[PDB]
Symmetry: C2
Subunit: 220 residues, 2 copies
Amino acid sequence: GITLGEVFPNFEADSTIGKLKFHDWLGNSWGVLFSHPRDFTPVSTTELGRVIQLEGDFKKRGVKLIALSCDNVADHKEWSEDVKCLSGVKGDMPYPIIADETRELAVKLGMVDPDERTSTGMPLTCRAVFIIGPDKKLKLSILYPATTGRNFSEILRVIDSLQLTAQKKVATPADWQPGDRCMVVPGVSAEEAKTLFPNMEVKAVPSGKGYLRYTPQPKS
Amino acid sequence: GITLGEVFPNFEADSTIGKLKFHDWLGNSWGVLFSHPRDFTPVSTTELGRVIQLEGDFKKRGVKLIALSCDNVADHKEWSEDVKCLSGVKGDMPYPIIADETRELAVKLGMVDPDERTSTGMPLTCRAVFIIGPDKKLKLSILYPATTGRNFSEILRVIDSLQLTAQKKVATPADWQPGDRCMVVPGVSAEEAKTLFPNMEVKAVPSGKGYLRYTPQPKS
């Protein structure tokens, strides 16, 4: 498996756009690598169609999308025609699909599904998401099972958080949506906070400390 | 780290309720173990206060809740009074907080924060969530960094999925909300699916396959 902060592997893999070297394909850019158990399966089709529907939304944020399963590239090309169809959107598939047939990414990234295997007991990936920064480090990950489809609104939400918190001395609270107030991180001094966050409110708490500090969302 | 389907470790840890043997505290019941970087920090208080607001929701689904940081039990009890106050709810902490002072769970669970350390460079945990079943296996996990507060409604959403998809041969699609229709798992034959799901729609796709099967939320 892969812990937060680690350089994401620079793997060579075959895909729907040919062989790709991961770090080269991503470049100086945010990326989201997401996996699914198997092609020609229903939840996976709703998810990958949903991602097509939301392509514009990841694009506005400069995030590159790439999907992955252990199926061959022939199965990825055929199945995309179903994915496209369900999306309702016209045109070519706007993201690649990796064929992890050797199961090297499955095992390395710790994204093997506990219940789903091939007819021959071969392993399969689950529903993983890896959010990768411009420095190639893993910033956030989820590991959902075959049974449970993902929530792409939440993915976009935590992207908004990560992109803002990379750039400003803030952290986003429970259930934050863009444009809600953020928390001033505990490492900013009372003195540093006077210039950086003029409009901060310190809200009092029984313990007396001065840590519960809110500020408007900064223009990033 | 911990992969999906692994038996969650039967760890002994101190807490705000004394030493815990994890599988003994859990008993035969779903549980959610969730971590936070450090007590007396702003985002961590908003999330732990929101858990208190939601504890009845977790109780209704039979989910035991348990928090964790690398702080000591005394800090946990002092700070618990600030979390209570943010929450708006009067009464006793409805969930334990584990002290992982050695960082042995931090490291075993693959939940070190990439960025946050103590003033001397010691590891702290990220915002990790693990959903463990009555069988003690890991069903889903998330790893969010200190920068990015979690969405505890997404946790409830995925619990509902996990619970329902353990009762019925269905899988929850992208962005599913309880009461929406699910997908019939692809492994289910044509003749079983017709026996179990009478209001099933089979949606024609360009590939001619018959996997894209919906069922109005099955009897639950």
